[PDB]
Design an enzyme around this catalytic site. Structure first.
Site, PDB file in Angstrom:
ATOM      1  N   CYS A 130       0.837  -1.178   0.000  1.00 29.46           N
ATOM      2  CA  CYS A 130       0.000   0.000   0.000  1.00 29.46           C
ATOM      3  C   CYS A 130       0.874   1.231   0.000  1.00 29.46           C
ATOM      4  O   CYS A 130       1.766   1.369   0.840  1.00 29.46           O
ATOM      5  CB  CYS A 130      -0.824  -0.012   1.259  1.00 29.46           C
ATOM      6  SG  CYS A 130      -2.295   0.987   1.247  1.00 29.46           S
ATOM      7  N   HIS A 173      -9.361  -3.941  -3.644  1.00 28.97           N
ATOM      8  CA  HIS A 173      -8.417  -3.224  -2.777  1.00 28.97           C
ATOM      9  C   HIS A 173      -8.724  -1.704  -2.804  1.00 28.97           C
ATOM     10  O   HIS A 173      -8.796  -1.043  -1.760  1.00 28.97           O
ATOM     11  CB  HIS A 173      -6.975  -3.484  -3.255  1.00 28.97           C
ATOM     12  CG  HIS A 173      -5.899  -2.701  -2.483  1.00 28.97           C
ATOM     13  ND1 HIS A 173      -5.010  -3.329  -1.608  1.00 28.97           N
ATOM     14  CD2 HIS A 173      -5.578  -1.382  -2.462  1.00 28.97           C
ATOM     15  CE1 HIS A 173      -4.208  -2.405  -1.105  1.00 28.97           C
ATOM     16  NE2 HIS A 173      -4.535  -1.240  -1.603  1.00 28.97           N
ATOM     17  N   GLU A 174      -8.919  -1.145  -4.004  1.00 30.34           N
ATOM     18  CA  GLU A 174      -9.186   0.310  -4.145  1.00 30.34           C
ATOM     19  C   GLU A 174     -10.585   0.684  -3.616  1.00 30.34           C
ATOM     20  O   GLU A 174     -10.783   1.728  -2.989  1.00 30.34           O
ATOM     21  CB  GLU A 174      -9.098   0.752  -5.608  1.00 30.34           C
ATOM     22  CG  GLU A 174      -7.696   0.588  -6.211  1.00 30.34           C
ATOM     23  CD  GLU A 174      -6.570   1.095  -5.304  1.00 30.34           C
ATOM     24  OE1 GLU A 174      -6.755   2.129  -4.558  1.00 30.34           O
ATOM     25  OE2 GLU A 174      -5.432   0.487  -5.288  1.00 30.34           O
ATOM     26  N   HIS A 177     -10.637   1.248  -0.009  1.00 33.01           N
ATOM     27  CA  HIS A 177     -10.124   2.571   0.390  1.00 33.01           C
ATOM     28  C   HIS A 177     -11.236   3.618   0.472  1.00 33.01           C
ATOM     29  O   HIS A 177     -11.224   4.497   1.345  1.00 33.01           O
ATOM     30  CB  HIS A 177      -9.097   3.106  -0.603  1.00 33.01           C
ATOM     31  CG  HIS A 177      -7.684   2.602  -0.338  1.00 33.01           C
ATOM     32  ND1 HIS A 177      -7.072   2.725   0.906  1.00 33.01           N
ATOM     33  CD2 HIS A 177      -6.788   1.988  -1.147  1.00 33.01           C
ATOM     34  CE1 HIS A 177      -5.864   2.197   0.821  1.00 33.01           C
ATOM     35  NE2 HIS A 177      -5.681   1.754  -0.398  1.00 33.01           N
TER      36      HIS A 177
HETATM   37 ZN   LIG Z   1      -4.072   0.826  -1.259  1.00 30.24          ZN
END
Ligand SMILES: [Zn+2]
Ligand SMILES: CCCC[C@H](CC(=O)NO)c1nc(Cc2ccc(F)cc2)no1
Ligand SMILES: [Zn+2]
Ligand SMILES: [Zn+2]
Ligand SMILES: [Zn+2]
Ligand SMILES: [Zn+2]
Ligand SMILES: [Zn+2]
Ligand SMILES: [Zn+2]
Ligand SMILES: [Zn+2]
Length: 203
Positions: A130, A173-174, A177
């Site tokens: 990350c 994953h995004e 966020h």
């Molecule tokens: Zn990330």
């Protein structure tokens, strides 16, 4: 504010624009964008994609001091909006011939979300990293193996897309966020490398 600095025509996003673990903006649920997009929101998406292209180019990464990456979400730039960019390159063959398609996924997605997924789980064998985390974090980040997502592009056109393999992992994953979730939240707390039977481990 932070977005005005980021969308200046001559400004290139680099590591100093990326906030770090501990910054509260990384733990918020980002605000949906409304269409038609403001010019700031449109340019931000484009700067984010430019950052991924630069990070994957050996000279520009070197020039700008960038870690290679395949995704970025606006909250990582201290902007609490549901905007992400993903750029996953295909790779040359053993003879050095470039791929048919340069990328298996290239998109700036507004208000993306998973609308369905496989019962089966998957995880990258090498774990995940990350841009906002400057620690070593070992372990399998358990995600959905396959997902169907929905998102809008900069024009407001809606798209529906099924993803699997590495592309599925990256978008998940995004999207995490913009929901205030970090990858290590999905790593087993007691044995980072535990494997529940049926987990698809991706090479
Ligand atoms: Zn990330
Ligand atoms: C599995 C997705 C990991 C993506 C990260 C970039 C990132 O921090 N995105 O939010 C990336 N880090 C190194 N290469 O790509
Ligand atoms: Zn900057
Ligand atoms: Zn534009
Ligand atoms: Zn460039
Ligand atoms: Zn739907
Ligand atoms: Zn579900
Ligand atoms: Zn889910
Ligand atoms: Zn933990």
């Amino acid at each position: 504010a932070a977005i005005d600095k980021l969308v200046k025509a001559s400004h290139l996003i680099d590591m100093n624009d990326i906030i770090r673990e501990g910054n509260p903006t990384l733990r918020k649920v980002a605000e949906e964008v409304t269409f038609p997009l403001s010019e700031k929101e449109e340019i931000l998406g484009e700067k984010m994609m430019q950052f991924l292209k630069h990070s994957q180019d050996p000279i520009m990464a070197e020039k700008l001091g960038l870690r290679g990456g395949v995704g970025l979400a606006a909250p990582q730039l201290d902007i609490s909006k549901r905007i992400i960019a993903v750029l996953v390159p295909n790779v040359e063959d053993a003879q050095g011939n470039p791929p048919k398609e340069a990328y298996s996924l290239q998109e700036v997605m507004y208000n993306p979300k998973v609308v369905s997924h496989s019962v089966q789980d998957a995880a990258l064998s090498d774990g995940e990293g990350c841009l906002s985390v400057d620690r070593e974090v070992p372990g399998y980040v358990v995600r959905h193996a396959r997902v169907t997502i929905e998102y809008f592009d900069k024009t407001g056109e809606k798209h529906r897309l099924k993803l699997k393999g590495y592309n599925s992992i990256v978008v998940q994953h995004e999207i995490d966020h913009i929901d205030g979730i970090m990858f290590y939240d999905r790593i087993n707390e007691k044995n980072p490398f535990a494997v529940k039977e049926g987990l698809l481990i991706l090479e």
